[PDB]
Amino acid sequence: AITCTACTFTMTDAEFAILNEGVAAPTIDPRGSFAGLQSLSGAPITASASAGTTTVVVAASNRNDANIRTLAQRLRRAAQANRITFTA
Amino acid sequence: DVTGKKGDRFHIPNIGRASVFDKLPETPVQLQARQESDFYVDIDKYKESSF
Question: Which residue of A22, A73, A77, B4 has the fewest CB atoms within a 10 Å radius of its CB?
Answer without folding.
Answer: B4
